[PDB]
């Protein structure tokens, strides 16, 4: 139960019972002539296998459930990768960084901070008739941000005194390793683009496999298949952290 | 009802449960029975036998598709299955008719079959005229012919034969011609090479023994499969073709 | 002098009215009756059809590795197209002639289904047009023709080519004139091949029902297992709606009658449909 | 010598009178029977038919203007014409020969009904004349004639040309001589197509009844679905009344016999009738 | 040697007498039975037929003067002719041969009736000879003969020419010699038209009974509706009388036997009969 | 070695006797059964037939000379002849073999009946030979032969020639070989005239029964109304007598067996019988 | 690896035994059934047949010497021949395979009867061989062959040649090879005289049953009234005896099996049988 917000939580969560989806996007708008497109959201599968030995698995029931939890987390980290930097090609999901609108460099003021850039992006969200939801950053990057000071010494963000959790400008922050070193993403995930769960994360095992049966090893797997849809590609903005 | 007149139906269908089959056939009957002069020595006749064996060969094939497509699309699940059956049964004839006899290939009909008599061909004969000749050559074993095997292409142009008057031989355009020739059923198989034909008393000259019926099985956890979240489909079958009377089958070439 | 012409008292005589209206030759609808019918509720239909079956099934040695054979099908999509037309009539006429509308309705439904049949058969496939049977159809095998064949032989040949995919042909589609010039065939001695002068032959050839529709172009023919290979999907049945508030109708006492219908044509086994041209 | 010669005693023997008058050949009247028969009490008939159906129904693109179809109509009129003739006879002849009265009647009735048939088939349409079946009938399409067709094939073709308007033919009308030469056709062997010398063939070909009438000009043939294509309307049946006060009649002791009739021929579907000419 | 020789004892043996005179072939009478029969007791007959019927029944315009039709009549006469012949025999032969007269009687009747039939058919018409069927009969239409017609076709053509009078035929008169070659006709294959060698065809052709008579000249044929085209009127039946005092018979010791008959052939409808000649 | 050879113990086994004697082919008599079987008691027969009937019956003008007709007769004779043969056998043999007597009788009758039938058909008509059918028969008409006539056509013609005497035919006489080559006739197409190879045709032709007899010479045919055109008169039925005292039979210890018969063939109507030669 | 071959656990699985033995093609015995099956008990047979019947029956003149006829006879003999063969097998084989005894019996019979039929048909006649039908039969008359005859025609001719002995035929004997090429005869058009690719024709020709056996030589053929022209006499039926003491069979632990039979073929009427050759 890692106390950290997930990119999965940022989006709306619903259920489905189909191969793919016939939903409709939104391209441009010259404020008139608006643009729309009937897209397909394919339900691709994701998971990662882990094989040990039956000599250990049968000699510890507590360790049984343990691995199940260690993999559920290991999956989310990979699931987070398919959602964010999702290629959207073969067996990859329609990623955010791929569909996201680029950052507007013309919003930078000579003399501001690293965090100021983030605030500027939050504004571009309104330029799509939508309300912002959250921020996705790289742990290392987000770290340097929380630890900022001025030319004199005072803390930019704020002292540890009245400190809390992961928020910025009143928005949830998800420090993921899936986010490239020096890249960021902001959007109105709450009502913009959502994910539909076809099959929840379940776990099964098999003594007979590639080798296993002859090696006495047992294979564990956490399979989960879902679909990612993008209603408003304008409501999302990805930008390069210039430094 | 698309009964393409299964080549199997033309043969005796029996079930087995062993590795192979062993039958006994009379090889050479030295018949010396003749007229005998009074108070003289008589003719000595002899008989030869042989233990002919018919091995049980296995035929099958497999496919591997993503599970996210099979368990997700049920009506397609059974589609691939029914297609592999057709695909297998199609190659089944391929052996029964053109078996090499060597190695694992079954001793097919054409392999065993006695060659056609090139002399029976008279000046100015039709293609169907020849098949008629074949039916006779089958009689050289004292057995009524049972069926005729032909390539759909050849058989097609057969039913469309005409007299020097103009009318059709097998049937006026008003109705389609039924697969029959000289009272014998006809089997159009792509397995039968063009220009080649097979005739004989299949009804009781050769028998097919089924050790295992054509079955289809799936493996959720075969080697890679579990990881690749796939599935392996298998359609197998175990046969055994026995040839009692080789002289009761003919193979020839449509020299035209 | 007191005649019946205009000059005289002919005004007193009123011609007898013939109750009813005269409709022209009402063509008998077919084609869609040959195909499988099904109802849908989507803007389109994503399906798949077996393209290439690589059969590798063979005799396997004991303890040996089995043959791998795969089936490659292409993912074709059948879009839902809309066919319709409207008539702008005077409201004065509609009220003065009661049963007029009832006529127009049964008249537009016909004109609709007519141009519908025209699509299912010769669908361009380009843009809004459907992928008609003749577009999808696999070309005729010219190598099947032999020295001294009749037009009847050709169809017979085609019927076989349908078996190349292994599917019994449902029927034969021909232009009424071609079908005619076929029923009237004679042998090299004179006798009639079909029915003789005594009586006309039925619309059956090689045990298969013959469909003569003016929809089929002259010199063109189509054979296949229609009742199996292709299916029609009715999104919206043919219906007629009337509105006098359309555009500036209310302001001009006009009545706009609309006759629409939504379709969708699919082709599961295209290999089972043959098309050709009679060389003359 | 006392012979039966004129210039002798042959004046006492009076030739035996054979009771009865010898009428010529009475043509079996038809045509009027092929058509539908109705009655009227007016002087003309008005019926309506669909003139031009401008069907523009086609595939429509999403968010686009649809095709506008149009329809045209017409008021077709069939006037009532009067056919008749009179005969002036001496009162002496009529009184001295009693049977004559009823004879002339049964003759004028025939003579009248003869020209009646003569109109229905070949009506000039010139003012007073009725628009006969031939003046109306759609001309035969020469394009149907193939290479090496018998006169029998031509009719078979004509029958079809009727179907080209979605209408079933009723019968075939030809000149007796033509029908003859037709029934006596032979193949390249010698056999009779309709019937070997054993017996004459029935008046039927291609499933349709054949009607040989001297009223039909030689080399001319008319095929069509008369039972549902045209209709005859009787205003006044053939009546015969006599009067001996007509002008001079009384003063010349004459007798005038009249035989009149009123008709009206309507042609609903002219497309369902075909006229043509054989190739000599 | 006491044999049965003439110069020996072969005089006591008397050859056995075979009773009954051997009469030759009796030609089966037919022509007489074909025509309708009736009798009279006068010198001649007078029947009246409609000559020229001027039919002007046409379409009359309103308020206009109608057409005038006329009917002409003619008086036709049929004279009674006498047929007979006598035999001058010897009284010696008559008394010495009792059953002789009885024989001659039943012999002269046939001999006379033979000429009776011979007259009814080929009646010259000139002088005292009757106007037989062949003279009255309307000549055959050479125009009806088409290229490639058999003798069987010609007769079939004639049957039609009879229909030009609105009267159906009832018989075909042919010379046995010709009727034979007709029944033995073959096609290109070689098969018999009327019947294979297995059995002989009945005397029927085109549904009409065939009458083969030696009275019909070779190469000549006659067809028509005899049962209603002509009628034979008998004034006096065939009678036989003998005279012992005829001329010098009393002195020469002779006996004359007479056999006479009085006929009268009427031809009501000449257009219902046809005479023709085979050109080959 | 005690074998059953001649020079050994074989002289002990007596060959089994096969009861009965093997008689050769017993020919089926026919000719005699075709005629009338009457019996006489004299050495000759005298019948009378009408020779020349000069029939001059014609139409006679009023008060004019009538025609004279004359008749002629003739006495035709038919002598009775005798057929017989004897066999001189050993009196000893007759006693040693009892069944021989009865056998010789039955064999002498057949032997006689053969030369009897041989006479009835081909009687030379000379000194002692009877006037056989073929000698009397009126020669076939060489004119009845047309272009391309089968051998079967000829007999068909012959049958007609019999009718030229107003008499119906009874049967046909042919040599078995000729009859054979006739049943095996084919048409220009190759088919069999009488019957397909599936079954041998019955002995009937043109409705008349066929009679194949080896007595009929090769290439000679006879047709007519035998049932009543000629008749056989039996003076003495065929009988067998035996004499022991005949000549030196008593001294040579012999036995003479005699088999005789007395026949008389009469030919009433020669015009009803036809003989001809198969020119080929 | 645990396979199922020699080097592995294949010795554990026993092949399934198929019940009994597979006898080769058993020819259908026919000839023996075509003849009269008589019973005897002697060494030979003596039948008497009439040789030369010098029939000189003729017409004899009055008081003249008569014709002398003579008859000749002969004693024909039919010897009884013996057919058989033996087979000595190991005592072991017999006891170890019970089914064998009864099998060998059935085989020696078919083997004997086979050479039996081979004698009856083509019996040499010399030495100990029987006088087979073919060596007795009268040769086919080449004269009967006409220009353009089929093989089927010739057989028809043979059937007649049988009649030339006053005896009706029984059946036809041909080598299946030749018989085959006959059923496949076509006319000048191309149609099968017997079949017509729908059904194989039955073994019947010219009303007579056909008998195709490999016993008959290729090109050779026989026709006649078998069921009356000849007779088979059985002295000893086909019996099978077993001896265990035959010579040294006791010491060698052997066992001899014999299968003997005694026959005698008689040829009553050789004239009723025909043999020939198909020159082509």
Same domain, E128 and E201: no
H or E element in which residue B187 lies: strand B184-188
Torsion of CA D263, D268, D271, D277, to 10 degrees: 0
Alpha helices in B5-126 (DSSP H): 67-70, 74-98, 109-112
Report the sign of the C-alpha dihedral through residues A80, A85, A89, A94, in that order.
Answer: positive
The residues that bridge with E77 in the sheet, in sequence order, are E46
Same domain, A161 and A188: yes
Report angle CA F155, F161, F162 to the nearest 5 degrees.
95
Alpha helices in B107-174 (DSSP H): 109-112, 127-137, 152-159
**Cα F76 off chain centre by:** 22
The residues that bridge with B209 in the sheet, in sequence order, are B14
Q: How far is C31 from chain D (nearest CA, A)?
A: 17
Q: How far is C63 from chain G (nearest CA, A)?
A: 7
Residue B221 has its nearest CB partner, among A19, A49, A208, at A208
What CATH number is given to the structural domain containing E71? 3.30.2400.10
What is the β-pairing status of strands C230-234 and C265-267?
antiparallel
Given CB atoms, is F191 within the 8 Å cutoff of chain D? no
Same domain, F238 and F224: no
Structural domain contains residue G25: no
- In sequence order, what are the residues at sequence separation of 6 or more whose Cβ sits closer than 8 angstroms to the Cβ of residue B165? C187, C188, C189, G189, G190
What A89-98 contacts at long range (C-beta under 8 Å, 24+ apart), as own/partner pairs, is A91/A44, A91/A45, A92/A44, A93/A42, A93/A44, A93/A227, A93/A228, A94/A41, A94/A42, A94/A228, A94/A229, A94/A230, A96/A185, A96/A187, A96/A193, A96/A230, A96/A236, A96/A238, A97/A183, A97/A185, A97/A238
Torsion of CA D5, D9, D10, D13, to 10 degrees: -160
Report chain C residues whose CB lies below 8 A from the CB of B164.
Answer: 188
H or E element in which residue D44 lies: strand D44-54
Give dist(CA F276, CA F174) in Å, integer: 11
The torsion angles phi and psi of E192, rounded to 5 degrees, stand at -80, 140
From the list E150, E149, E83, E148, the residue with the least C-alpha distance to E113 is E83
Q: What single-letter DSSP state applies at residue G28?
A: P
Tell which residues of chain B come right before a gap with C–N over 2.5 A: none
Report chain F residues whose CB lies below 8 A from the CB of G53.
Answer: 24, 107, 111
Resolution in A: 7.5
Given CB atoms, is G103 within the 8 Å cutoff of chain F? no
Report chain A residues whose CB lies below 8 A from the CB of B229.
Answer: 45, 47, 223
Given CB atoms, is F70 within the 8 Å cutoff of chain E? yes
Give dist(CA C221, CA C156) in Å, integer: 12
Instruction: Dig out the tokens for A47 from the structure.
Output: 């998971």
Residue G165 has its nearest CB partner, among F25, F107, F200, at F25
Residue that is written with structure tokens 């990612």 in the block: A228
Could C200 and D206 be called an inter-chain contact, meaning their C-beta atoms sit closer than 8 Å? yes
Give dist(CA C108, CA C240) in Å, integer: 8
Same domain, C261 and C143: no
Same domain, B107 and B22: yes
First to last CA, chain A: 35
Give dist(CA E202, CA E204) in Å, integer: 6
Could E69 and D111 be called an inter-chain contact, meaning their C-beta atoms sit closer than 8 Å? yes
Tell me if D240 sits within 8 A of D85, measured CB to CB: no
Same domain, C77 and C130: yes
Helix (H, G, I), strand (E, B) or coil at B55: strand
Residue G48 has its nearest CB partner, among F22, F85, F129, at F22
What G98-104 contacts at long range (C-beta under 8 Å, 24+ apart), as own/partner pairs, is G99/G20, G99/G21, G101/G242, G103/G21, G104/B47, G104/G257
Tell me if B18 sits within 8 A of B237, measured CB to CB: no
Same domain, B239 and B251: no
Is F48 buried (19+), middle (13-18) or exposed (0-12) by CB count in 10 A?
A: middle
The residues that bridge with G239 in the sheet, in sequence order, are G260
Structural domain contains residue D259: yes
The residue count of chain A comes to 243
Instruction: Dig out the tokens for G192 from the structure.
Output: 């099968």
Tell me if D231 sits within 8 A of C20, measured CB to CB: no
Same domain, C273 and C176: yes
Q: What single-letter DSSP state applies at residue C120?
A: H
Tell me if E45 sits within 8 A of D18, measured CB to CB: yes
Report angle CA F268, F208, F131 to the nearest 5 degrees.
30
For chain E, list the strands marked E by DSSP: 16-17, 36-39, 44-54, 58-60, 70-79, 81-90, 138-139, 171-174, 204-205, 208-212, 220-224, 230-234, 236-243, 254-263, 265-267, 273-277
Residue E146 has its nearest CB partner, among D181, D190, D197, at D181
Which subunits count as partners of chain C given 3+ CB pairs below 8 Å?
A, B, D, E, G
Give dist(CA G121, CA A35) in Å, integer: 102
Centre a 10 Å sphere on the Cβ of residue A69 and count the other Cβ atoms it contains.
10
Given CB atoms, is C21 within the 8 Å cutoff of chain B? no
Give dist(CA A11, CA A82) in Å, integer: 14
Mutation target for B interface from G4, G10, G16: give the one with most B CBs within 10 A: G16
Give dist(CA F55, CA E87) in Å, integer: 10
CA atoms within 13 A on the CB side of C169: 28
Could C188 and B152 be called an inter-chain contact, meaning their C-beta atoms sit closer than 8 Å? no
The torsion angles phi and psi of C199, rounded to 5 degrees, stand at -155, 150
H or E element in which residue A121 lies: helix A114-126
Could C191 and B167 be called an inter-chain contact, meaning their C-beta atoms sit closer than 8 Å? yes
The torsion angles phi and psi of E222, rounded to 5 degrees, stand at -140, 130
Structural domain contains residue D71: yes
- In sequence order, what are the residues at sequence separation of 6 or more whose Cβ sits closer than 8 angstroms to the Cβ of residue C24? D50, D53, D165, D271
Q: How far is D27 from chain C (nearest CA, A)?
A: 26
Same domain, F57 and F105: yes
In DSSP notation, E241-267 reads EEESSSTTHHHHTEEEEEEEEEE-EEE
Structural domain contains residue G99: yes
Tell me if B138 sits within 8 A of B113, measured CB to CB: no
Report chain F residues whose CB lies below 8 A from the CB of E108.
Answer: 57, 69
Is G108 buried (19+), middle (13-18) or exposed (0-12) by CB count in 10 A?
A: buried
Residue G97: domain span: 30-136+230-268
Give dist(CA G246, CA G248) in Å, integer: 6
Helix (H, G, I), strand (E, B) or coil at C100: helix
Q: Looking at chain G, which residue has its C-alpha nearest residue E4?
A: G62
Please name the method used to determine this structure.
X-ray
- In sequence order, what are the residues at sequence separation of 6 or more whose Cβ sits closer than 8 angstroms to the Cβ of residue E22? F47, F48, F49, F50, F268, F269
Give dist(CA A149, CA A170) in Å, integer: 20
The rounded radius of gyration (Å) of the Cα atoms in chain G is 27
Give dist(CA C143, CA C154) in Å, integer: 11
Same domain, F127 and F77: yes
Same domain, A42 and A158: no
Could C1 and E62 be called an inter-chain contact, meaning their C-beta atoms sit closer than 8 Å? no
Given CB atoms, is C42 within the 8 Å cutoff of chain A? yes
Q: Do chains A and B touch (3 or more CB pairs under 8 A)?
A: yes
Could D57 and C191 be called an inter-chain contact, meaning their C-beta atoms sit closer than 8 Å? no
Q: Do chains A and G touch (3 or more CB pairs under 8 A)?
A: no
Could A38 and C43 be called an inter-chain contact, meaning their C-beta atoms sit closer than 8 Å? yes
Same domain, F43 and F122: yes
Given CB atoms, is B27 within the 8 Å cutoff of chain A? no
Cα dist. B141→B107, D199, G22, G61 in Å?
20, 55, 13, 71
H or E element in which residue G162 lies: helix G151-163
Widest Cα–Cα separation across chain F: 121
Give dist(CA A173, CA A90) in Å, integer: 30
Structural domain contains residue E208: yes
The residues that bridge with F230 in the sheet, in sequence order, are F267
Structural domain contains residue A1: no
The residues that bridge with F195 in the sheet, in sequence order, are none
In DSSP notation, C35-72 reads SEEEE--SSEEE--EEEEE----EEE-TTPPPPB--EE
Structural domain contains residue G179: yes
- In sequence order, what are the residues at sequence separation of 6 or more whose Cβ sits closer than 8 angstroms to the Cβ of residue F43? E4, E10, E13, E15, F79, F80, F235
Question: What SS3 string covers G42-86?
Answer: CCEEEEEEEEEEECCCEECCCCCCCCECEEEEEEEEEECEEEEEE
What CATH number is given to the structural domain containing A138? 3.30.2320.10
Structural domain contains residue B1: no
Q: How far is G165 from chain F (nearest CA, A)?
A: 5
**Cα A8 off chain centre by:** 6
Mutation target for A interface from B229, B230, B231: give the one with most A CBs within 10 A: B229
Query: Number of structural domains, chain A?
Result: 2
Centre a 10 Å sphere on the Cβ of residue C112 and count the other Cβ atoms it contains.
23
Given CB atoms, is C22 within the 8 Å cutoff of chain D? yes
């Amino acid at each position: 139960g890692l106390r950290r917000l997930t990119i999965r939580d940022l989006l709306a969560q619903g259920r489905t019972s189909s191969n793919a989806l016939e939903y409709v996007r939104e391209e441009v708008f010259t404020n008139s002539d608006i643009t729309f497109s009937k897209q397909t959201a394919n339900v691709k599968t994701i998971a990662h296998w882990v094989q040990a030995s039956r000599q250990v698995m049968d000699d510890a029931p507590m360790l049984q459930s343990y691995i199940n939890n260690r993999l559920m987390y290991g999956l989310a980290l990979k699931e987070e990768g398919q959602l964010l930097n999702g290629d959207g090609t073969g067996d990859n999901l329609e990623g955010l960084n791929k569909v996201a609108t680029a950052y507007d460099t013309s919003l930078n003021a000579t003399g501001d901070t690293r965090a100021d850039i983030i605030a500027h992006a939050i504004y571009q969200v309104t330029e799509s008739e939508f309300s912002a939801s959250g921020i996705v950053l790289n742990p290392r990057d987000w770290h340097n941000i929380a630890l900022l000071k001025d030319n004199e010494g005072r803390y930019i963000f704020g002292g540890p005194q009245a400190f809390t959790s992961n928020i910025m400008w009143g928005l949830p922050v998800v420090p993921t390793k899936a986010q490239a070193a020096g890249t960021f993403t902001v959007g109105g995930f709450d009502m913009a683009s959502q994910v539909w769960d076809r099959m929840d994360a379940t776990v099964e095992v098999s003594r007979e496999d590639r080798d296993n049966f002859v090696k006495n090893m047992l294979t564990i797997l956490c399979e989960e298949r879902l679909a990612l849809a993008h209603y408003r590609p304008t409501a999302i903005i990805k930008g390069t952290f210039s430094s």
